[PDB]
Write an enzyme that holds these catalytic residues in place. Structure first.
Site, PDB file in Angstrom:
ATOM      1  N   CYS B 108       0.810  -1.227   0.000  1.00 49.38           N
ATOM      2  CA  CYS B 108       0.000   0.000   0.000  1.00 49.38           C
ATOM      3  C   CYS B 108       0.835   1.265   0.000  1.00 49.38           C
ATOM      4  O   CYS B 108       1.587   1.537   0.940  1.00 49.38           O
ATOM      5  CB  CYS B 108      -0.964   0.039   1.216  1.00 49.38           C
ATOM      6  SG  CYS B 108      -1.998   1.517   1.270  1.00 49.38           S
ATOM      7  N   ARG B 111       0.069   4.567   2.854  1.00 52.77           N
ATOM      8  CA  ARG B 111       0.154   4.356   4.297  1.00 52.77           C
ATOM      9  C   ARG B 111       0.586   5.550   5.144  1.00 52.77           C
ATOM     10  O   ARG B 111       0.631   5.453   6.369  1.00 52.77           O
ATOM     11  CB  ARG B 111       1.087   3.190   4.582  1.00 52.77           C
ATOM     12  CG  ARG B 111       0.464   1.845   4.277  1.00 52.77           C
ATOM     13  CD  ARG B 111       1.474   0.739   4.561  1.00 52.77           C
ATOM     14  NE  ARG B 111       2.496   0.660   3.505  1.00 52.77           N
ATOM     15  CZ  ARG B 111       3.625  -0.030   3.622  1.00 52.77           C
ATOM     16  NH1 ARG B 111       3.895  -0.680   4.750  1.00 52.77           N
ATOM     17  NH2 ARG B 111       4.492  -0.074   2.611  1.00 52.77           N
ATOM     18  N   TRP B 280      -9.286   6.728  -0.462  1.00 50.08           N
ATOM     19  CA  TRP B 280      -9.584   7.467  -1.666  1.00 50.08           C
ATOM     20  C   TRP B 280      -8.629   7.026  -2.804  1.00 50.08           C
ATOM     21  O   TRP B 280      -7.604   6.388  -2.562  1.00 50.08           O
ATOM     22  CB  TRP B 280      -9.480   8.970  -1.410  1.00 50.08           C
ATOM     23  CG  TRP B 280      -8.184   9.423  -0.841  1.00 50.08           C
ATOM     24  CD1 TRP B 280      -7.005   9.620  -1.527  1.00 50.08           C
ATOM     25  CD2 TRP B 280      -7.910   9.741   0.527  1.00 50.08           C
ATOM     26  NE1 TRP B 280      -6.025  10.040  -0.661  1.00 50.08           N
ATOM     27  CE2 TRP B 280      -6.555  10.126   0.604  1.00 50.08           C
ATOM     28  CE3 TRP B 280      -8.690   9.750   1.702  1.00 50.08           C
ATOM     29  CZ2 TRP B 280      -5.957  10.510   1.808  1.00 50.08           C
ATOM     30  CZ3 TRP B 280      -8.096  10.130   2.894  1.00 50.08           C
ATOM     31  CH2 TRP B 280      -6.743  10.507   2.939  1.00 50.08           C
ATOM     32  N   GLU B 285      -5.117   4.161 -10.633  1.00 46.40           N
ATOM     33  CA  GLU B 285      -5.985   3.014 -10.392  1.00 46.40           C
ATOM     34  C   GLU B 285      -7.154   2.991 -11.369  1.00 46.40           C
ATOM     35  O   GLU B 285      -7.468   1.952 -11.950  1.00 46.40           O
ATOM     36  CB  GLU B 285      -6.492   3.019  -8.961  1.00 46.40           C
ATOM     37  CG  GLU B 285      -5.404   2.744  -7.938  1.00 46.40           C
ATOM     38  CD  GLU B 285      -5.979   2.699  -6.518  1.00 46.40           C
ATOM     39  OE1 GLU B 285      -6.417   1.606  -6.114  1.00 46.40           O
ATOM     40  OE2 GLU B 285      -6.015   3.739  -5.820  1.00 46.40           O
TER      41      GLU B 285
HETATM   42  C1  HEM Z   1      -6.292   6.682   1.799  1.00 50.56           C
HETATM   43  C2  HEM Z   1      -5.710   6.561   0.602  1.00 50.56           C
HETATM   44  C3  HEM Z   1      -5.175   5.223   0.036  1.00 50.56           C
HETATM   45  C4  HEM Z   1      -4.528   5.144  -1.127  1.00 50.56           C
HETATM   46  C5  HEM Z   1      -4.236   6.358  -2.056  1.00 50.56           C
HETATM   47  C6  HEM Z   1      -4.177   3.751  -1.347  1.00 50.56           C
HETATM   48  C7  HEM Z   1      -3.516   3.265  -2.452  1.00 50.56           C
HETATM   49  C8  HEM Z   1      -3.312   1.946  -2.729  1.00 50.56           C
HETATM   50  C9  HEM Z   1      -2.911   1.392  -4.001  1.00 50.56           C
HETATM   51  C10 HEM Z   1      -2.678   2.190  -5.298  1.00 50.56           C
HETATM   52  C11 HEM Z   1      -2.774   0.074  -3.845  1.00 50.56           C
HETATM   53  C12 HEM Z   1      -2.379  -0.886  -4.986  1.00 50.56           C
HETATM   54  C13 HEM Z   1      -3.616  -1.710  -5.320  1.00 50.56           C
HETATM   55  C14 HEM Z   1      -3.847  -1.988  -6.782  1.00 50.56           C
HETATM   56  O1  HEM Z   1      -3.193  -1.356  -7.649  1.00 50.56           O
HETATM   57  O2  HEM Z   1      -4.717  -2.855  -7.064  1.00 50.56           O
HETATM   58  C15 HEM Z   1      -3.106  -0.274  -2.456  1.00 50.56           C
HETATM   59  C16 HEM Z   1      -3.070  -1.535  -1.869  1.00 50.56           C
HETATM   60  C17 HEM Z   1      -3.520  -1.887  -0.602  1.00 50.56           C
HETATM   61  N1  HEM Z   1      -4.073  -1.007   0.329  1.00 50.56           N
HETATM   62 FE1  HEM Z   1      -4.076   1.055   0.210  1.00 50.56          FE
HETATM   63  N2  HEM Z   1      -4.625   2.983  -0.267  1.00 50.56           N
HETATM   64  C18 HEM Z   1      -5.263   3.877   0.604  1.00 50.56           C
HETATM   65  C19 HEM Z   1      -5.882   3.538   1.794  1.00 50.56           C
HETATM   66  C20 HEM Z   1      -5.924   2.299   2.388  1.00 50.56           C
HETATM   67  C21 HEM Z   1      -6.655   1.924   3.596  1.00 50.56           C
HETATM   68  C22 HEM Z   1      -7.553   2.884   4.429  1.00 50.56           C
HETATM   69  C23 HEM Z   1      -6.414   0.615   3.809  1.00 50.56           C
HETATM   70  C24 HEM Z   1      -6.893  -0.312   4.952  1.00 50.56           C
HETATM   71  C25 HEM Z   1      -7.427   0.151   6.097  1.00 50.56           C
HETATM   72  C26 HEM Z   1      -5.529   0.138   2.750  1.00 50.56           C
HETATM   73  C27 HEM Z   1      -5.032  -1.134   2.619  1.00 50.56           C
HETATM   74  C28 HEM Z   1      -4.437  -1.677   1.505  1.00 50.56           C
HETATM   75  C29 HEM Z   1      -4.122  -3.073   1.380  1.00 50.56           C
HETATM   76  C30 HEM Z   1      -4.348  -4.189   2.438  1.00 50.56           C
HETATM   77  C31 HEM Z   1      -3.503  -3.215  -0.013  1.00 50.56           C
HETATM   78  C32 HEM Z   1      -2.971  -4.537  -0.608  1.00 50.56           C
HETATM   79  C33 HEM Z   1      -4.023  -5.225  -1.448  1.00 50.56           C
HETATM   80  C34 HEM Z   1      -3.424  -6.487  -1.999  1.00 50.56           C
HETATM   81  O3  HEM Z   1      -2.491  -7.051  -1.359  1.00 50.56           O
HETATM   82  O4  HEM Z   1      -3.898  -6.926  -3.081  1.00 50.56           O
HETATM   83  N3  HEM Z   1      -5.267   1.186   1.912  1.00 50.56           N
HETATM   84  N4  HEM Z   1      -3.406   0.913  -1.819  1.00 50.56           N
HETATM   85  C1  LIG Z   2      -7.270  -7.187 -10.422  1.00 48.86           C
HETATM   86  N1  LIG Z   2      -6.300  -6.927  -9.343  1.00 48.86           N
HETATM   87  C2  LIG Z   2      -6.855  -7.337  -8.038  1.00 48.86           C
HETATM   88  C3  LIG Z   2      -8.168  -6.600  -7.802  1.00 48.86           C
HETATM   89  C4  LIG Z   2      -5.810  -7.051  -6.958  1.00 48.86           C
HETATM   90  C5  LIG Z   2      -6.426  -6.913  -5.583  1.00 48.86           C
HETATM   91  C6  LIG Z   2      -7.032  -7.998  -4.953  1.00 48.86           C
HETATM   92  C7  LIG Z   2      -7.610  -7.837  -3.686  1.00 48.86           C
HETATM   93  C8  LIG Z   2      -8.148  -8.839  -3.089  1.00 48.86           C
HETATM   94  N2  LIG Z   2      -8.611  -9.730  -2.516  1.00 48.86           N
HETATM   95  C9  LIG Z   2      -7.565  -6.610  -3.053  1.00 48.86           C
HETATM   96  C10 LIG Z   2      -6.956  -5.523  -3.680  1.00 48.86           C
HETATM   97  O1  LIG Z   2      -6.928  -4.315  -3.039  1.00 48.86           O
HETATM   98  C11 LIG Z   2      -6.072  -3.272  -3.486  1.00 48.86           C
HETATM   99  C12 LIG Z   2      -6.532  -2.032  -2.770  1.00 48.86           C
HETATM  100  C13 LIG Z   2      -7.039  -2.141  -1.481  1.00 48.86           C
HETATM  101  C14 LIG Z   2      -7.488  -1.010  -0.810  1.00 48.86           C
HETATM  102  C15 LIG Z   2      -7.425   0.225  -1.439  1.00 48.86           C
HETATM  103  C16 LIG Z   2      -7.869   1.365  -0.788  1.00 48.86           C
HETATM  104  C17 LIG Z   2      -8.426   1.264   0.606  1.00 48.86           C
HETATM  105  C18 LIG Z   2      -7.788   2.590  -1.440  1.00 48.86           C
HETATM  106  C19 LIG Z   2      -7.270   2.651  -2.734  1.00 48.86           C
HETATM  107  N3  LIG Z   2      -7.183   3.836  -3.390  1.00 48.86           N
HETATM  108  N4  LIG Z   2      -6.853   1.526  -3.347  1.00 48.86           N
HETATM  109  C20 LIG Z   2      -6.918   0.328  -2.729  1.00 48.86           C
HETATM  110  C21 LIG Z   2      -6.477  -0.799  -3.396  1.00 48.86           C
HETATM  111  C22 LIG Z   2      -6.387  -5.674  -4.945  1.00 48.86           C
END
Ligand code: HEM
Ligand SMILES: CN[C@H](C)Cc1cc(C#N)cc(OCc2ccc3c(C)cc(N)nc3c2)c1
Ligand code: HEM
Ligand SMILES: CN[C@H](C)Cc1cc(C#N)cc(OCc2ccc3c(C)cc(N)nc3c2)c1
Ligand SMILES: C[C@H](O)[C@H](O)[C@H]1CNc2nc(N)[nH]c(=O)c2N1
Ligand SMILES: C[C@H](O)[C@H](O)[C@H]1CNc2nc(N)[nH]c(=O)c2N1
Ligand SMILES: [Zn+2]
Lengths: 410, 411
Positions: B108, B111, B280, B285
């Site tokens: 993420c 963070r 947000w 994305e």
């Molecule tokens: C507030 C602004 C936030 C932004 C701009 C942001 C941005 C991102 C982005 C760009 C990714 C890559 C995901 C993708 O490309 O599919 C990601 C992953 C992730 N985010 Fe954040 N996020 C935010 C908030 C949060 C919050 C509030 C949480 C949890 C409370 C969170 C938890 C996670 C987790 C667990 C992943 C990993 C998902 C995975 O392993 O597939 N994020 N985030």
């Molecule tokens: C096709 N690629 C897949 C969808 C990758 C992915 C899988 C899962 C799951 N389970 C969860 C995922 O979460 C990414 C993520 C999680 C949380 C986010 C928040 C809270 C904000 C944000 N701007 N992006 C997020 C992006 C991504």
């Protein structure tokens, strides 16, 4: 243990068994992945022979004569030479095989679909820096081929015991000079500022321009290295113009056609070749994204956007992105206009997926470093981005080695 | 052990000791790196050590380690485990747990905001209707009329794995995808499977390109139920381009609130299988992945056509040009409508600051380069040149199988 990789764009699933033949370690552990780290004393007799056996075993398998008299003979022959001379010499055939497979196994190289069409120049009879210069000029001329680039490697004598190392002190055979300037910034190429200086600090007379082709600094048999100027007629360069912006010409940019990396170490069957310049041809992003736009390099983004009069007041206008694209369109346009070999990142990554599927098919896998294979722009619209990869170290290989000036007994 | 990482653009070097606190495994060995692999019923036996380490962490953070409050809580949790084979978190522990699961999320980039999470305790929830109510309130609170606020809603923890709470949607708000007889797809190709399930469960599909999917909610192990989010709670943004007037005519829009709802929250060994969280968007994305991935809306060609690009040769970089414009439009539309968004330059810069701050105060910041680097213009963002260490810390968010593959149907 028989691992699988998925492509998430196409759902293609390949099964990897080649990784079981890996020997060297990755730097990762069960608790920590080091996949984004840039970089994670002679061989004894007991050290050398298993290395030689491993190599000959794979060589005679490849020529489908595993377990043949010729195989067992050659095994015998090398084993005795090792216990005798505390080293051994490769036959020409094995040298060529070893070199081609070190490219094949380079997990960071996107261009490996071409790996078997490598021209191998045996320079193991070389004894002097002047000799090295001659071999390097011949390499440059052959590889350049008037713009029709051809892959090539030139291999100098192998390390004996660190005392007699052959080394090319340049990081590439052709690179532009970088000068400190009293003002503050840097003229030419910042990446090369130290080497640019060591050349002067050795005796080079710099024209102090922005695109000064560096002299060669060549080290034979461990002696002090010597300066040599590459004949300008051998250095093919491309003036950089844009196919729609006339003002682009006036930026005064050019680049060289031949990427020839010269500071790496080639390891074959335990033997170490510390001087082994190799060359292919450029992917456009190497120049247009990294060389021109890295802040630690030519860093021309600000100036280009300025000339496009983009809104540079905030990052969210994506002016950097917009300029980055135009720059790369221009690099490709220029090389292509001059019939100099170049490949765009869409073409090369597509070729690489085809190469991957080839290697999985006929070899059982393909070591690949996602962090380096994915291009430095537009990553997810290229097919390698959605390609899962497995990274592991196979031999023969290309390895990093210290810069000579930190090591060389002056 | 000490471990150093180098920023190759700035020559800044940081030292990681936090990796020593890493418990879980990466999937990597000394002979293979699985760094680019997408993905690499619990008894009283293994639970109390998991609880103890959590509570040791919790009481260290509040500067009460080894206090009587610490030891009594340990004892209290122990007895509750021995007696009931599980245990309940205090509210303070839950809040701490959820924030640190986010803090620990190595993929993420957002963070820097981890400490400002709004945590909603829905552990008193018992039915799907109750779930729907909690989620509506989450959406309203999080959305805040465009002024987005991070939030998570936490439903009851797993018990015997036969009574799970699950949100069957991958995100709370997503567009439907419809496979047509001629092999084309209408809407979001990413959601064709889930769309089909909804329809089977009795959803009446509008069958348009941007239909907000219904919520499919599962409480206490029962069959999931369909609910429609009130449309006035679903904030959407019409996409237009600042210079290209034809862009609006592509008929695109997107929703403002990204809210992921299929992940599992682990805290002190407890598993929270329904824990929707939201923040947000980073522009890319939507503008890179959602619109331009070949397996998604895939509008690159149509945009390139209307820009009148050379689409014959790929070396004209018409794809790269179109992508930039689409991403300009996404940012432009959100800002114009005063809906919270961040561009990838701002976000990656913020993350570097966050990462450095974390090395200083925490001794490390686990990070997954493969996911942190943006899907466009990678090397002109500062995270590209930043070496990173990836390791797994708890509390954490984990993946879990899609519910329709494991669920036992009641009828
Ligand atoms: C507030 C602004 C936030 C932004 C701009 C942001 C941005 C991102 C982005 C760009 C990714 C890559 C995901 C993708 O490309 O599919 C990601 C992953 C992730 N985010 Fe954040 N996020 C935010 C908030 C949060 C919050 C509030 C949480 C949890 C409370 C969170 C938890 C996670 C987790 C667990 C992943 C990993 C998902 C995975 O392993 O597939 N994020 N985030
Ligand atoms: C096709 N690629 C897949 C969808 C990758 C992915 C899988 C899962 C799951 N389970 C969860 C995922 O979460 C990414 C993520 C999680 C949380 C986010 C928040 C809270 C904000 C944000 N701007 N992006 C997020 C992006 C991504
Ligand atoms: C012919 C076309 C070729 C293309 C398009 C190509 C492309 C690339 C690119 C883009 C990289 C990324 C490195 C960077 O960004 O600095 C790379 C790495 C590399 N290439 Fe290739 N290459 C080609 C030929 C060759 C040849 C002929 C060899 C050797 C015989 C080779 C060996 C390597 C090695 C060893 C690396 C990684 C070294 C490291 O660990 O840093 N390549 N290549
Ligand atoms: C600033 N980043 C640094 C320069 C990374 C790097 C280090 C070394 C070394 N030693 C060698 C490197 O070589 C990469 C490479 C090697 C060979 C190439 C060939 C033959 C062709 C080509 N187009 N690119 C190459 C790229 C890269
Ligand atoms: C194969 C590869 O691991 C996979 O496509 C990953 C790469 N990096 C990513 N990075 C982000 N932010 N989001 C993703 O979905 C992915 N996908
Ligand atoms: C920190 C990171 O490992 C470093 O910047 C790497 C990332 N990926 C790369 N990829 C390529 N092709 N070339 C590079 O020099 C790098 N640098
Ligand atoms: Zn790894």
């Amino acid at each position: 243990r028989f691992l699988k990789v998925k492509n998430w764009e196409t759902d293609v699933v390949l099964t990897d068994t080649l990784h079981l033949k890996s020997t060297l370690e990755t730097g990762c552990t069960e608790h920590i992945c080091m996949g984004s780290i840039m970089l994670p004393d002679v061989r004894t007799k007991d050290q050398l022979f298993p290395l030689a056996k491993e190599f000959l075993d794979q060589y005679y398998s490849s020529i489908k004569r595993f377990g043949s008299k010729a195989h067992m003979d050659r095994l015998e022959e090398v084993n005795k030479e090792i216990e005798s001379t505390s080293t051994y010499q490769l036959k020409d055939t094995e040298l060529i095989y070893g070199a081609k497979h070190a490219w094949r196994n380079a997990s960071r190289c996107v261009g490996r679909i071409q790996w078997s069409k490598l021209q191998v120049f045996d320079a193991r009879d070389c004894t002097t820096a002047h000799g090295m210069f001659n071999y390097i000029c011949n390499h440059v001329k052959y590889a350049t081929n008037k713009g029709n680039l051809r892959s090539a490697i030139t291999i100098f004598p192998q390390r004996t015991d660190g005392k007699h190392d052959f080394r090319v002190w340049n990081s590439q055979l052709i690179r532009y000079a970088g000068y400190k300037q009293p003002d503050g910034s840097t003229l030419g190429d910042p990446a090369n500022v130290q080497f640019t200086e060591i050349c002067i600090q050795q005796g080079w007379k710099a024209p102090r321009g922005r695109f000064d082709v560096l002299p060669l600094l060549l080290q034979a048999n461990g002696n002090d290295p010597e300066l040599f100027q590459i004949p300008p007629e051998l250095v093919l360069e491309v003036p950089i113009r844009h196919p729609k912006f006339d003002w682009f010409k006036d930026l005064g940019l050019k680049w060289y056609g031949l990427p020839a990396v010269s500071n790496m170490l080639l390891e074959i069957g335990g033997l170490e070749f510390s001087a082994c310049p190799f060359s292919g041809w450029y992917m456009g992003t190497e120049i247009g994204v990294r060389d021109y736009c890295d802040n630690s390099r030519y860093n021309i983004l600000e100036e280009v956007a300025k000339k496009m009069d983009l809104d540079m007041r905030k990052t969210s206008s994506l002016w950097k992105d917009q300029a980055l694209v135009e720059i790369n369109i221009a690099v490709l346009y220029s090389f292509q206009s001059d019939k100099v070999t170049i490949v765009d990142h869409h073409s090369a990554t597509e070729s690489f997926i085809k190469h991957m599927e080839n290697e999985y098919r006929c070899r059982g896998g393909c070591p690949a470093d996602w962090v380096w294979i994915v291009p430095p722009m537009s990553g997810s619209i290229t097919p390698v981005f959605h390609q899962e990869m497995l990274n592991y170290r196979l031999t023969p290989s290309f390895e990093y080695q210290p810069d000579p000036w930190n090591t060389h007994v002056w």
